[PDB]
Symmetry: C3
Subunit: 114 residues, 3 copies
C-alpha cells in the first residue's frame, strides 16, 4: 500500500512519529505486512477545500487489493481520525482517493508484482 497526504498544515504541526503511526495503523487495517507499506506526508501546501484555506487534506491510498466499499469506509474512519487527532484537520475537510491497483501495474525491485 502507498498512502499520500497533502495538507496546508505547517511542517511544525506534524508530530514526531507520525509516519510510523501511519505505517503501523495501515498495516493493521489493510492486513498487509508493514514492510510493504509506504507513507508520504506533504505539509505547507497551497490548498483550498470548499473555497476555504482552513486546514484540509487531499490524500490517496493505493493498494493491490484490499480496496472496496466496506474496507474503504473503515480506512476513512481510521485515517480521518488520525488526521483530526494529530494534525487537527476536520474530517469533513479531507478527501481520500482509493485506488485498487492491478499487480501488473505496480513496479518494485526491478520488476512488478504480477
Amino acid at each position: 500500500p502507498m498512502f499520500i497526504v497533502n495538507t496546508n498544515v505547517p511542517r511544525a504541526s506534524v508530530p514526531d512519529g507520525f509516519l510510523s503511526e501511519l505505517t503501523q495503523q495501515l498495516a493493521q487495517a489493510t492486513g498487509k505486512p508493514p514492510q510493504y507499506i509506504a507513507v508520504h506526508v506533504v505539509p505547507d501546501q497551497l490548498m483550498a477545500f470548499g473555497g476555504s484555506s482552513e486546514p484540509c487534506a487531499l490524500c490517496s491510498l493505493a493498494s493491490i487489493g484490499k480496496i472496496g466499499g466496506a474496507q474503504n469506509r473503515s480506512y476513512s474512519k481510521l485515517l480521518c481520525g488520525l488526521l483530526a487527532e494529530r494534525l487537527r484537520i476536520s474530517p469533513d475537510r479531507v478527501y481520500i482517493n482509493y485506488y485498487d491497483m492491478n499487480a501488473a501495474n505496480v513496479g518494485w525491485n526491478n520488476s512488478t508484482f504480477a
Copy 2:
C-alpha cells in the same frame, strides 16, 4: 471534484485569488457546489516537458462522475485557459489527467461517498 496543478512557475508568479478562481470555475464547469471542490497548486517544481524547463504543468482532475469525452474537452479548454492567463503557461505544455472516481472509492468525513 479535486484539481491539482504541479508546475515549475515560482510561487510569486501565482496571483492572489487564484485558488478561488479555480474553485469557482470548476464548480461551474462540473456543476457541483463549490463547497465540494478542492484545489491544490504546487509551484517551484523541478519539471521538464518535452525535454525543456520552460513553464509547464502536470495536473489532475478527479471527480465522482462528470468525466467523459466532451466534458473533458471542455474542462481542458477552461483549465488551459486559466493556466495560460494566470500563470503564463502555454497550453501545449499542460497535461491534465482525468479520473472518474466511483463514490465508494472516495473517502470523506470518516466514511465514503457511497
Copy 3:
C-alpha cells in the same frame, strides 16, 4: 507519457542532467517522441517505506497505451536502475504505479488526446 518521482533524497543529490536523462530514456523505452514526455522529480520529501526513512521513492508512469505486463516489467528494471545509479536508492525501496490512460482522459492544448 508522464513520469513522477517523489523521494526523500535531498535536492543536492539529484544530478544535473537527471530530468534530461529520464526524458531520453523514457522516450526510448515507451517509443514515444521526447516532445511528449514529461518528467517531474520531487526531492526532500517526508516519506517512509516499510517504516524506514532510508532512501526510497514513490513514482508514477502514466501513458496513453504502452502499458502492460511485459512492458511494465521492463520499465521497472529501467527506472529502478536509474534511481539506483543516480539517486542511490535501493530497487527494493521503490514503488512505481503504472497508469494506462484513455486518450479521452488526458487533457492537453485546450482539448484531449481523443
